Structure 1
Amino acid sequence: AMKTVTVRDLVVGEGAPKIIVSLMGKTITDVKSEALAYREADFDILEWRVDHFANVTTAESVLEAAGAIREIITDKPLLFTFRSAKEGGEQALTTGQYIDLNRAAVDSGLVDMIDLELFTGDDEVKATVGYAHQHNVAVIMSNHDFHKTPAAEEIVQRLRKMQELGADIPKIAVMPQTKADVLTLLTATVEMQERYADRPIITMSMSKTGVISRLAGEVFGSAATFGAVKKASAPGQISVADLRTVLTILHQA
């Protein structure tokens, strides 16, 4: 049976899917103005897309920015996410730099969760998951394909490997090229959820064509969904207000 994941008092895996929004700021000044602009938006988890932050290799700066968000947004769990260039991110980093950055986030005491990419390297992932858990920081383990939708079987295999590597919440986002691809993503979601999952999972088919996948998580088994405040962090994200509207209708229908 599926256990839930509680982050800064939000319980993920129960009830209606939770809404995650991404905050993107190049400088400390932008991060602060965006955080202020997000303050009153209707979402559940705040993801900080750190790869949008210039010169992330200056430790003191990343810390300062994290502290700035944490003081403006006091009522939401914070997810620290450096999306690698490999998986659609805005910046290149070495594996070493990537792991150091996430370990720095963990020991800061400022973040509730970190995002770690499944294909970073098994050894590095196991170690960083261990380090996170030792500091009471949850891990969303992710995989993204911005060009195509892999076969359902391959999608399920990846989500299963995320569980094996210790993810608190497995997450996969794929790009549909056809309408059938959207159904392939939902099939994988259902099969994973019904046969192998023992914790919450997050799945999505990107683009306007895949939008339905961001709304039907309650029936098909995705525990959270991404929405946009102003600009999307990945294609297909709709406004958090509209997202909450639909999720509530579906929760009570």
Structure 2
Amino acid sequence: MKRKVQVKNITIGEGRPKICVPIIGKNKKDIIKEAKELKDACLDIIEWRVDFFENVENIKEVKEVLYELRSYIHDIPLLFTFRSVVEGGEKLISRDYYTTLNKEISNTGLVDLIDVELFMGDEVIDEVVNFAHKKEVKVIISNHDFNKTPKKEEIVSRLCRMQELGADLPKIAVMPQNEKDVLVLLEATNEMFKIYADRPIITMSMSGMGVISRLCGEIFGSALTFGAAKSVSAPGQISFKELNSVLNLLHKS
């Protein structure tokens, strides 16, 4: 009754939640060094957090890294994400360029998924999505709130809008100010998963307090969880290796 998102040998939205490991190097040497350490590691998808790449405004240099990166990762699903400043990024860039970066990178045929930020707008979203599906690229439409956890109804409403915008995978990250906020996130996730969701969704409650939301996706509905290699790409992620053992332990419980 729900659609699944297949990327290579990985089926998002079925079985145990899929582990995604970010690459956050500031330069080609470190990025390649990062990719080499993950080739034979136990994980499902790799996310290139390009917002960390120092020459990110130079599209040719971004492609150069992308080529070399695919050579080492060959058939591991690869998500491309430029996380903007409003949603936790550190590099500021034009909105016209955010579109160009995502389109040009989508056009290479080298990325399997691309992340597009909801707030960025219908104009930006529709163009990135239409062009990503041209090349069979799956799209994550994402939304992050680093200060608050909206009410469950509001969270559900955002995941629904993302779905209307053609997102192959709606994604929402929220920040708890208390323990109950964490449960509100889980509550909205399962209501979405059971009643309104039409495909897989990705959700998380950030920081140490909401870490449970990164582990219990199999019961509650989040199809993908992010684990860190050396350093964190978002507050609350634990090492991908420990995430793998916890997900496996819960798969047989």
TM range (shorter): over 0.9
Cα distance between partner residues in 1 of 2:215 and 2:58? 38
Give 3-state SS (helix, strand or coil) of 1:22's partner: strand
Question: Which residue matches 2:207?
Answer: 207
**Shift in Å at residue 75 of structure 1?**
3.3
- Residues 208 and 235 in structure 1, CA contact (< 8 A), matched pair in contact too: yes
Partner of 1:169: 169
The alignment's TM-score, normalised by the length of structure 1, stands at 0.98
Instruction: Give distance in 2, aligned partners of 1:238 and 1:29.
Output: 24
Give the C-alpha shift of residue 217 in structure 1: 0.6
Aligned residues of 1:22 and 1:49 also touching (Cα < 8 A)? yes
Task: Give SS of 1:141's match.
Answer: strand
Deviation digits for residues 133-156 of structure 1, max 9, x if unmatched?
A: 011111011001112111111111
What amino acid does structure 2 have at the position aligned with 1:217? G
**Matching residue of 1:102:** 102
Offset from partner CA, 1:66-120 (integer Å, 9 cap, x none): 1111111123100000000110002111110100000011101110110000110
Report if the CA contact (8 A) 1:41-1:240 is conserved: no
Is 1:17–2:17 an aligned residue pair? Answer: yes
Which amino acid in 1 is paired with 2:14? Answer: E
Preserved contact between residue 141 and residue 170 of structure 1 (Cα < 8 Å): yes
Please, what is the CA RMSD of the aligned residues? 0.9
Stretches of structure 2 that go unaligned for 5 or more consecutive residues are none
1:242 is matched with 242
Normalising by structure 2, report the TM-score: 0.98
Matched, 1:223 2:223: yes
Identity across matched positions, percent: 56
How big is the shift at 1:34?
1.3
| Counterpart position of 1:47 | 47
Q: Matched residues in 1 for 2:150 and 2:109: separation?
A: 37
Residue 232 of structure 1: CA displacement? 1.1
Aligned partner of 2:238: which letter? Answer: I
CA apart distance, 1:35 = 1.1
Aligned partner of 1:65 in structure 2 is 65
Name the CA distance, whole Å, in 2 between partners of 1:7 and 1:101: 21
Q: Summarize deviations over 1:226-245 as a string: whole Å, max 9, x none.
A: 11111110011111111111
2:84 aligned residue: 84
Q: Which amino acid aligns with 1:33?
A: K
- Residue 8 of structure 1 corresponds to 8
Counterpart for residue 131 of structure 1: 131
Aligned residues: 253
Letter in 2 for 1:212: I
